[PDB]
């Protein structure tokens, strides 16, 4: 359908664009066009309007935090994450297209394994235990908040899994 194509082209990576403006700017464009927000290292305020992203010096601004609420990000859109070196916080809230494969793709990016400190996954109805358990590759994670994930059926197993793989993790669960 047209809507499938439209979501796909919102997500598709343009590698020319990454070459021209660098990974952080290209990912910022992807996130904001898809209804997410980003916040750069050294800045208090969030980027929430695509047209107000900085034009500024080339590749200066580095994403620290991502807040994708009510966003159409999915699957291969996360390939925009590949070049980012300094992402510490990700919130995925009411991201109706996210699935386990998105979380798997993120978990395999060594750049994110090195930098990630905090993640929050809220009201993303497709996510299951499999996608959550993939997050154990974020070896530096200190905070994980899971909420309203009806597909996560075995929350006790998740707690024990993380107890072993990430003993220092503060795991906050608001799960049925
Ligand atoms: Mg939003």
UniProtKB/Swiss-Prot annotation:
The entry's keywords: ATP synthesis, CF(0), Hydrogen ion transport, Ion transport, Leucine-rich repeat, Magnesium, Membrane, Metal-binding, Mitochondrion, Mitochondrion inner membrane, Repeat, Transit peptide, Transport
Cellular component GO terms, alphabetical: cytoplasm; mitochondrial inner membrane; proton-transporting ATP synthase complex
Nucleotide-binding keyword on record: no
Disulphide bridges, residue numbers: none
The keyword Transport is annotated on this UniProt entry: yes
Major location (coarse): mitochondrion
Residues reported to bind Mg(2+): 35, 69
A Gene Ontology molecular function term of the record: metal ion binding
Compartment list: Mitochondrion; Mitochondrion inner membrane
UniProt repeat feature LRR, residue ranges: 38-63, 64-92, 93-117, 118-149
Gene Ontology BP annotations: ATP biosynthetic process; proton transmembrane transport
Family recorded in the similarity comment: Belongs to the ATP synthase subunit s family.
Subunit text: Homotetramer. Associates with ATP synthase.
Function, in words: Involved in regulation of mitochondrial membrane ATP synthase. Necessary for H(+) conduction of ATP synthase. Facilitates energy-driven catalysis of ATP synthesis by blocking a proton leak through an alternative proton exit pathway.
Protein known as: ATP synthase subunit s, mitochondrial
Gene name for this UniProt entry: DMAC2L
């Amino acid at each position: 359908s047209f809507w499938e194509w439209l979501n796909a082209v919102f997500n598709k990576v343009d590698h020319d664009r990454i070459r021209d403006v660098g990974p952080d700017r290209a990912a910022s464009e992807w996130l904001l066009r898809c209804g997410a927000m980003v916040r750069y290292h050294g800045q208090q305020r969030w980027q929430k309007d695509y047209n107000h992203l900085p034009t500024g010096p080339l590749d200066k601004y580095k994403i620290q935090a991502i807040d994708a609420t009510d966003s159409c990000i999915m699957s291969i859109g996360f390939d925009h994450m590949e070049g980012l070196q300094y992402v510490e916080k990700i919130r995925l809230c009411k991201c109706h297209y996210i699935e386990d494969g998105c979380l798997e793709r993120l978990s395999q990016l060594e750049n994110l394994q090195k930098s990630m400190l905090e993640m929050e996954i809220i009201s993303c109805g497709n996510v299951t235990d499999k996608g959550i358990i993939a997050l154990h590759h974020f070896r530096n994670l200190k905070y994980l908040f899971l909420s309203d994930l009806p597909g996560v059926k075995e929350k006790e197993k998740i707690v024990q899994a993380f107890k072993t793989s990430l003993p220092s993790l503060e795991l906050k669960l608001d799960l049925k």
